[PDB]
Amino acid sequence: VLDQLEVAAEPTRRRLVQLLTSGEQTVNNLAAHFPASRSAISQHLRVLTEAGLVTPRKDGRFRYYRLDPQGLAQLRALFDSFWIDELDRLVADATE
Amino acid sequence: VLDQLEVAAEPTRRRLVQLLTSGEQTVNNLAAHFPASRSAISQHLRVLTEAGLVTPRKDGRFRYYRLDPQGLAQLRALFDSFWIDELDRLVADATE
Ligand SMILES: [Mg+2]
Ligand SMILES: [Mg+2]
């Protein structure tokens, strides 16, 4: 089945999730933040919907998407179980 | 170019990164933790290498991989910039 963290981590999908934090929005309005087409953004939103991260609603000529807390909680759980302590310890070893 | 968070988030790659926290390991030894073939695991390790998350070394008949802190620091930075406050607030709205 779809893993929420794998799906969400795609960089356009990350940005779509951030954009939706300001509330439910139309496909066309979200799509205006990217060089990619409406159709491209629509397909990313369908993938996020299948993963349980966003939820669609239709009202007339607009399709709206909003974040689903249920999916976000599973996303955060997957990242928390992935990111074990030694990974934080290694990050602290990094130079720049 | 490769985004470390997108690459790392693939579920086999997440587990390979966790496994490597116990130290540098051979391809065959890592591969023994999964139903997938050596060849499959080898290819995931090549992707992680290209993303700067792991580093290869050859000694005789073994190829060894180890975590690269430089890549892990960028991975953690990408997740931290993605996961904005409102996402934590929404996770707290989730039921179960
Ligand atoms: Mg809601
Ligand atoms: Mg090292």
Other Cβ atoms less than 10 A from the Cβ of B20: the count is: 22
Report the C-alpha dihedral over residues B74, B79, B80, B82, rounded to 10 degrees: 120
Q: What are phi and psi of B62, to 5 degrees?
A: -120, 145
Task: Tell me the nearest-neighbour CA distance from A64 into chain B, angstroms.
Answer: 18
Is any Cβ of chain A less than 8 angstroms from the Cβ of B80?
A: no
Whether A91 sits inside 8 A of B72 (CB atoms) is yes
Other Cβ atoms less than 10 A from the Cβ of A93: the count is: 12
Cα dist from B69 to A12, A93, A95, B75, whole Å: 25, 6, 8, 10
Experimental approach taken:
X-ray
Q: Bin A55: left if φ > 0, else alpha if -120 < ψ < 50, else beta.
A: beta
Taking the domains of chain A in order of start, what are their residue ranges? Answer: 1-96
Cα dist from A95 to A40, A83, A90, B40, whole Å: 38, 20, 11, 32
Q: How many Cβ contacts (< 8 angstroms) between chains A and B?
A: 82
CATH of segment(s) A1-96: 1.10.10.10
| Rounded-to-integer distance, Cα A79 and Cα A30, Å | 25
Is any Cβ of chain B less than 8 angstroms from the Cβ of A66?
A: no
Nearest ligand to the C-alpha atom of residue A66: 1
Q: Which resolution, in Å, applies to this structure? A: 1.5
